[PDB]
Design a protein around this nucleic acid. Structure first.
Ligand SMILES: [Zn+2]
Ligand SMILES: [Zn+2]
Lengths: 365, 163, 365, 163
DNA sequence: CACGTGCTAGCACGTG
DNA sequence: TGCGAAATTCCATGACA
DNA sequence: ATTGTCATGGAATTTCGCA
DNA sequence: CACGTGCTAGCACGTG
DNA sequence: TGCGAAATTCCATGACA
DNA sequence: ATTGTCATGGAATTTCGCA
C-alpha cells in the first residue's frame, strides 16, 4: 500500500478511472469485466510473476493467464516479459521461433584448382580392409577424386593428397573441422606445399556442401551398382570416379571433365563438337564457358527470420547435449559479423568462436 | 587430317633399373602426345602386372584413344593387349630398335631421363619421395615450340606453382 | 537400315525434311545445327539408350546429353524415359521430387475419454532403477498421466493402465505399433475392458502427434527443473504431471484440467470465475466450451505434391535400410485410399499394409 | 455461503483389517464432498506412511481445499499435518466418536462399506484385484438426491461404462 | 534365434 | 466521435518422434 | 484396417481509456 | 585419460 | 505469318552431412 | 578467422517443322 491514493479517489498514471478500487480482507481490489481481481503493490509483483511462471516455466501468455486468475495491474505482460529474460532455465532450454537468414550462394571458384573441398565418407562395409573414402572435389569444375583409406587419419589423408597434387597444386583447401584436417601435421603438410587451409564453421555441413552433395552422387551410384551383390565397393571407386566426373550437370550443360579439359577423353559417348578447332581455338572457348556458367542467387528471406548485429545477445546450440539437458549454452555476444550468415562470438568459455547463424538463436527479451 | 588434341595418344616407357628407393626400381613414364604432359608411376618391376596397377590409377582420371610404346615385354604381352581392348584403347608399336615419336615427345622423354638422373646423384638413393616434385616441374616446364606449359595446355590456365 | 527410304528422299512420319540424310562408313547420318549425328535403326536404339544410361544410372536429361554427343532420332527422350521406367536400380534408389499431400487435421475427440493417446518416453537416465515413462494423453482435453516403468513392456503398460482406468474407461486407445502395444496380451487386456485398439501407420510418429507433442512439454519441463542438478526425474513426474495438466494452452484459453473438470482444484493461481454458478449451471458451460474450441484446418498443398489414386504404382520407404543399400522397396499397387494421406498397399511380401503416404513415393514413369 | 463444488472437500477414512489379499489389509477411502466421487487405495496398514504414498498419487491428479477425517492415528499425526500444510490443504476433524458428514458422504461411505463386504464373501479372500471394478461401480452408481452419477458430476459427460 | 517396430546410444581421430 | 497506447490475437518455427 | 501438434514471442491487429 | 568434432551404429520388446 | 507438337528449360524437393 | 548443393522428372514454356 504505497500507490493507494486510488482508495481516496486520486489518479495514478496507467490506472484507468471508470472502475472502482475498494478494499477487502486487507487487500486492494478492483472490479473488472473479467471479474474482481487483486492489485498488489510494486514490491509484491516481481515475486508473484515468478511464482506463476515457475509453475511450469511457461511462456508469455501461459504465464500471464495464471496471474489473470487472481490479479490485475497496469501492463502485467511488461513485468512478465522482464521475468522471462531473467529466468536462466527457460533461456537455455526453450527452442526458438525465429529462422536463420536466407542462405548465401558463394561465388563458384574462378579457375580449376582455386579451391579444393574435402570430406571423409564412412565407416563403410569392410571391403579389402578399407573402411573410408576420402573425397576430393574441385570447386570450379566439380571434378572429383576418390581415395580408399583404412581410417580418417592425417597419416592417410596426406598419403592420398600427394598422389593427387602430382597433377597440380590448389590455392585453397576447404574442409569440415574433422579431426585429421585440423591436426598440426596437416597444417604442416599444407604449409610446406604452400596451400591455405580454410575451415567450415563447426556442426554445419552445408559449409562443405560441395563435397557432401558429391558424396550423395557417390553413395547413390555405388548402391545402384551393388544391388543384389554383397557390398564390395573397393574395386568400384575407380569405376564410380570416372563415371561421375563424366556425367552432365543438366543446369550447367557440362561434365566436370569438360570443365577441366575442354574435350572428353576416350570414354563412352565421347563428345567431339570441338573437334575441328585447334587446341588453342578450343582452350579459349573453355575460358568462356567457365565465365558464363549458371549461378544461383540467395532465396528470399523467411517472413520470420533474424540477422545478427554486433553486440546482440545470442546463444549457441549445445554441441552434443546430454539426455534431459538443455539444448542451448548460456547467452553471449556478437563481436564480428563476417557475413549475413557467419558470426564470431564471445564464446561461453570464453573464447572466440566462428559459428554459423544456424547454430545460433537470438536471445529473447 | 584434323588438328591434334590431348588424350589422342599417350606415350609410355619404363626407366630402370634405378637405385632401390623403398623397393621401387623402375618408373613408368606416360606423356600426353599433344600437350606433352607427364605422369610418373614408381614400380617394382617393368611387368604388365605393375603397368596395369598404374595405368588404372591414370585411366580413372582420363583415357587415351591410343597407347604407343616400344616392344618391351610388359607392353607386348597378351595380358596388356586384353587390358587395352577392354577399354577401347588402341595399341600402336614403335618398330624394334628404331624408336618413334613426334618432336615434342622425344625431347620430353629426354628432359625426364636427364632430370631424373641429376636428382639421382644431387639427391642420392632416396628418389621415390621426390617423383611428385619432378612431375610438377616437368608439367610446369616452359615450351619453346608452343609458348605454353603442359599444365597450361592441359587445364587452360596458369599453374599455381610456376617454374 | 529399314526406315532408310530417307536415303532416296522419301518422307517418314516424325523425321524433319529441311535436313539432308546421307551415308558414311556404313551408317545413316544427319546434318544438324548441333553438328553431324548418327541415326541408328529402331532395333539398335533401346540398346544404345541403355548403354548410355548405365554409365552412371543417370536421370532423363543427363542420360540424353550423353546420347546427344553422337546420335539423333525422333523424340529420343520418349525412348529414354521408357528405359528409366524399366531400370530396377534407379527406381529403387533415386529419391523423389514429389512432396506428400497436405496434412489432415483430425477432428478433436468429442468428449473426454473418447480417445486415449499413448507412447513410451525413453530410455532415460536411471532414476530409482526406472528407465521409461508411459505417457497417457486424453484426446479431447489433453489431460495427461505419467507412469514410471522399468521397461516398455505389456507387463508394465497393463499395470499402469489399471491404476488409470479406475477413474474411467476410454472408448478408444491409439498408439504407435510399439512392441508392447501390438502384443496379443494387450489386445486381451483391452478386449476384456471392452476398449477398441486403434493403431498408427508404421514409421510415422505424427500419427501419435498428440502424445509426442506432449512428450515435448514433458521433456522440456523436466530439463528446466533438473538444471545444475544430476538427473533424478522419478520424484518429479508427479510435479510435472500436475503442472502440465494445469498450464493454459494460449490458443484454447484453457488448461487440460479445466477442459476435464470445469473448475480448478486447489492448485496455485486457482481460477474462480465460475464460483457463483451451481455445479449444474457450471457443468453446462463446460459442454459449451468443449464444442466451440479453436480447431486448425489443413494447410494448402505444396506446388509439387502428389495424392494417391487406386491402382497407382507406388513404392515404400525401406524400414531400416542397410549401408549402401537402396532406400525404396520394389514398386507396388494402391488398393484402398483410406484418406488423402493413408493408403493400403499390396505390400512387397506380398501382404496388406496400411502405410502413410509419407513413407511412399509415386513410382516415376 | 456460495454453492458447493468438487475438490472443495475430500472425506477420507480407513477400512480394515481385511483378509490378507497380497498383503493389503486395509483400504483408504477418499470421497469427493460434492460429487460423491470415490477413490480407493489398498494399503498394508493405516499409517501416515501409506496414507501419504496414496494421497500423493491422488493429489497429482487434483487437489482438495480441505481434507476431513476421524481422529484416527494416521490422520492426526504431525507427519500428516506437515504433508497437508505443504500443499495448502486445510485439515478438518470429526469430533471424537460422533462422526460427521453431509447426507451424501454418509451414504456413499456406507455403499462402499457394504459393497466391499459382499464381494468379500461372494468373491472371497482375493479382493485386491477387484478394487478397480468396485471403484467404477461406485462412481457410476446412480444418485437419488441429484439424478446424476459421480462420473457425470465430475466429468460432465456420460460414463463409457454405465451401471 | 532372426524380424518388425520404437527408442538412444556408439566409435572415429588428434590433442591436451 | 477519433486518436495514442495498451492489450489481446495472429502465426511460423521448432521438437516430439 | 486410418489421419500431426501446440508452446512460444515478435509482429500484426483489434479493443480501450479518454476526449 | 577426458574433450571437440565428424561419422553409424546400438538396444528395447513380443512373436514366430 | 500462326498453329500443333516437339523439345528444351524451369524448379522444388530431397539427401549429403 | 567465413559462406549450401545439384540430380531429378512432371509442369511450364520457349523453340520447330511446316504452311
Ligand atoms: Zn523459466
Ligand atoms: Zn538405372
Amino acid at each position: 500500500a504505497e500507490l493507494d491514493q486510488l482508495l481516496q479517489g486520486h489518479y495514478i498514471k496507467g490506472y484507468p478511472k471508470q472502475y472502482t478500487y475498494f478494499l477487502e480482507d486487507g487487500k486492494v481490489k478492483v472490479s473488472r469485466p473479467e471479474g474482481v481481481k487483486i492489485i498488489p503493490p510494486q514490491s509484491d509483483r516481481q515475486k508473484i510473476v515468478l511464482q506463476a511462471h515457475n509453475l511450469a516455466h511457461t511462456g508469455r501468455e501461459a504465464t500471464l493467464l495464471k496471474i489473470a486468475n487472481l490479479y490485475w495491474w497496469p501492463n502485467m505482460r511488461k513485468d512478465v516479459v522482464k521475468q522471462l529474460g531473467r529466468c536462466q532455465q527457460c533461456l537455455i532450454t526453450n527452442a526458438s521461433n525465429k529462422a536463420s537468414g536466407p542462405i548465401l550462394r558463394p561465388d563458384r571458384p574462378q579457375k580449376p584448382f582455386d579451391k579444393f573441398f574435402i570430406d571423409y565418407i564412412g565407416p563403410l562395409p569392410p571391403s579389402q580392409g578399407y573402411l573410408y573414402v576420402l573425397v576430393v572435389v574441385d570447386g570450379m569444375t566439380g571434378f572429383t577424386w576418390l581415395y580408399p583409406t583404412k581410417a580418417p587419419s592425417t597419416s592417410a589423408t596426406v598419403k592420398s593428397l600427394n598422389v593427387l597434387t602430382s597433377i597440380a597444386i590448389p590455392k585453397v583447401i576447404h574442409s569440415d573441422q574433422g579431426a585429421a584436417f585440423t591436426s598440426s601435421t596437416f597444417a604442416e603438410w599444407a604449409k610446406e606445399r604452400g596451400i591455405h587451409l580454410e575451415f567450415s564453421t563447426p556442426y554445419h555441413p552445408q559449409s562443405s556442401g560441395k563435397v557432401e552433395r558429391k558424396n550423395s552422387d557417390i553413395k547413390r551410384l555405388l548402391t545402384k551398382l551393388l544391388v543384389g551383390r554383397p557390398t564390395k565397393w573397393y574395386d568400384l571407386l575407380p569405376v564410380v570416379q570416372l563415371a561421375l566426373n563424366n556425367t552432365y550437370s543438366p543446369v550447367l550443360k557440362y561434365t566436370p571433365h569438360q570443365l577441366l579439359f575442354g574435350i572428353d577423353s576416350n570414354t563412352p559417348f565421347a563428345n567431339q563438337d570441338t573437334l575441328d578447332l585447334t587446341r588453342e581455338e578450343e582452350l579459349s572457348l573453355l575460358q568462356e564457358i567457365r565465365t558464363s556458367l549458371y549461378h544461383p542467387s540467395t532465396p528470399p528471406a523467411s517472413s520470420r527470420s533474424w540477422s545478427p548485429v554486433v553486440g546482440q545477445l545470442v546463444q549457441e546450440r549445445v554441441a552434443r547435449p546430454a539426455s534431459l539437458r538443455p539444448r542451448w549454452h548460456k547467452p553471449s555476444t556478437v563481436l564480428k559479423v563476417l557475413n549475413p550468415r557467419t558470426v564470431v562470438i564471445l564464446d561461453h568459455l570464453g573464447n572466440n568462436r566462428t559459428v554459423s547463424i544456424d547454430n545460433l538463436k537470438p536471445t529473447s527479451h | 587430317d584434323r588438328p591434334q588434341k590431348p588424350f589422342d595418344k599417350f606415350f609410355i616407357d619404363y626407366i630402370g633399373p634405378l637405385p632401390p628407393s623403398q623397393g621401387y626400381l623402375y618408373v613408368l613414364v606416360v606423356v600426353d602426345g599433344m600437350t606433352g604432359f607427364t605422369w610418373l608411376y614408381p614400380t617394382k618391376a617393368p611387368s604388365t602386372s605393375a603397368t596395369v596397377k598404374s595405368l588404372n590409377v591414370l585411366t580413372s582420371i582420363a583415357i587415351p584413344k591410343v597407347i604407343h610404346s616400344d616392344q618391351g615385354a610388359a607392353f607386348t604381352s597378351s595380358t596388356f593387349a586384353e587390358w587395352a581392348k577392354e577399354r577401347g584403347i588402341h595399341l600402336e608399336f614403335s618398330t624394334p630398335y628404331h624408336p618413334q615419336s613426334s618432336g615434342k615427345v622425344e625431347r620430353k622423354n629426354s628432359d625426364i631421363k636427364r632430370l631424373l638422373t641429376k636428382l639421382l646423384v644431387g639427391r642420392p638413393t632416396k628418389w621415390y619421395d621426390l617423383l611428385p616434385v619432378v612431375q610438377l616441374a616437368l608439367n610446369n616446364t616452359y615450351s619453346p615450340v608452343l609458348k605454353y606449359t603442359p599444365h597450361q595446355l592441359l587445364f587452360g590456365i596458369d599453374s599455381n606453382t610456376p617454374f
